From Swiss-Prot, chain D:
Quaternary assembly: Probable peripherally associated component of the endosomal sorting required for transport complex III (ESCRT-III). ESCRT-III components are thought to multimerize to form a flat lattice on the perimeter membrane of the endosome. Several assembly forms of ESCRT-III may exist that interact and act sequentially. Interacts with CHMP1A. Interacts with VTA1; the interaction probably involves the open conformation of CHMP1B. Interacts with CHMP2A. Interacts with VPS4A; the interaction is direct. Interacts with VPS4B; the interaction is direct.
Function noted in UniProt: Probable peripherally associated component of the endosomal sorting required for transport complex III (ESCRT-III) which is involved in multivesicular bodies (MVBs) formation and sorting of endosomal cargo proteins into MVBs. MVBs contain intraluminal vesicles (ILVs) that are generated by invagination and scission from the limiting membrane of the endosome and mostly are delivered to lysosomes enabling degradation of membrane proteins, such as stimulated growth factor receptors, lysosomal enzymes and lipids.
Lineage: Eukaryota, Metazoa, Chordata, Craniata, Vertebrata
Similarity remark: Belongs to the SNF7 family.
Gene designation per UniProt: CHMP1B
Subcellular location: Cytoplasm, Cytosol; Endosome; Late endosome membrane
Range covered out of full length: 58 to 110 of 199
Name recorded for this polypeptide: Charged multivesicular body protein 1b
Tissue specificity field: Widely expressed. Expressed in pancreas, kidney, skeletal muscle, liver, lung, placenta and brain.
Superkingdom per UniProt: Eukaryota
Length: 160, 160, 53, 53
């Protein structure tokens, strides 16, 4: 499908370029007319005048085609990108669906209260551990000593 | 599943870029109109005016698609990251569970009173060792000598 | 297509409820580490002086 | 864009919290294992080193 989009854009830019040439030729042809009629030739001056004119109207005609073809090119662009979005969206709806069948909310919620209970047990493990761990080395940290220390750095705390 | 996320973001940034072009072309097309009507041509001036307009409304249309597609892209993003978090969380709940079955709190607590008793025995080992170790070399450290020393550095202690 | 789209609404709707649920249990498990009172006094702390620098 | 900023940033918060507690869980794990290690090695070296000898 892309192939046709690319050919349309190509045809558009094509028409623009050709129109551009015909216009350029038009200007050059004015110049050439002036050189011609400078001699006093009334025939060459004629067919040059003529080719100048046709170059200009061709410029109009081509450039018009460039317009309309460009427009269809735009809408085709929209059509393709729309296509991509549609496909990909179908993709997420499906994968998410078949992953919504085994992930259906009940199993999740269960997994979550299971979660609460779980790390709750983590916390009690922690607490227990730190009780025995702090009652084994506790000879090296009297309560009294810590009291007088904390007081020591209390009264003078911000005095430096 | 990632593939569709990436295609959606891609389509969004795509639409933005194309909109940007159409806008740029719009400005250039104003300029080109002015050059055109400068001659006095009332036809080229027409189809240029026209293409300018359509470029602008296309800018609106595309840019709108960019908006909405971007929105769906965002919510899909949320869906994926949510997915990752869910899986990984299931992971920790399980590993932690099967490690909560053989680590069940009773065995830990037992291990901990065993811990207290253990390093308690460490301390008595220490004490004993230092008693014999300090009663073997004790000829080289009289008590009297240490008394007079400590006193010596007591009275003048802070006098320097 | 249209069918696929209402299916779409329903789908990500379920996404949102999944989200909400998850964040309820997830925020009620660690909630010891974020008292309500503490947050109140904090937000107030940075309220009164907020733009004073 | 702004409301998304809120929503995402909220998820960042809660997920971060669970991340923290999981961190604690792992480090706790390491400490537990290693501690079991010292209790055992020290024990089997407390059997032939028993205080009388």
């Amino acid at each position: 499908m892309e192939k046709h989009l690319f050919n349309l854009k190509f045809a558009a830019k094509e028409l623009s370029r050709s129109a551009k040439k015909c216009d350029k030729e038009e200007k050059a042809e004015k110049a050439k007319i002036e050189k011609a009629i400078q001699k006093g030739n009334m025939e060459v001056a004629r067919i040059h005048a003529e080719n100048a004119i046709r170059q200009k109207n061709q410029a109009v005609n081509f450039l018009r085609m460039s317009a309309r073809v460009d427009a269809v090119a735009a809408r085709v662009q929209t059509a393709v990108t729309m296509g991509k979005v549609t496909k990909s969206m179908a993709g997420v709806v499906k994968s998410m669906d078949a992953t919504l069948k085994t992930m259906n909310l009940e199993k999740i919620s269960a997994l979550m209260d299971k979660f609460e209970h779980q790390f709750e047990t983590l916390d009690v493990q922690t607490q227990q551990m730190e009780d025995t761990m702090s009652s084994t080395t506790t000879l090296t940290t009297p309560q009294n000593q810590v009291d007088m220390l904390l007081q020591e750095m209390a009264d003078e705390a911000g005095l430096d």
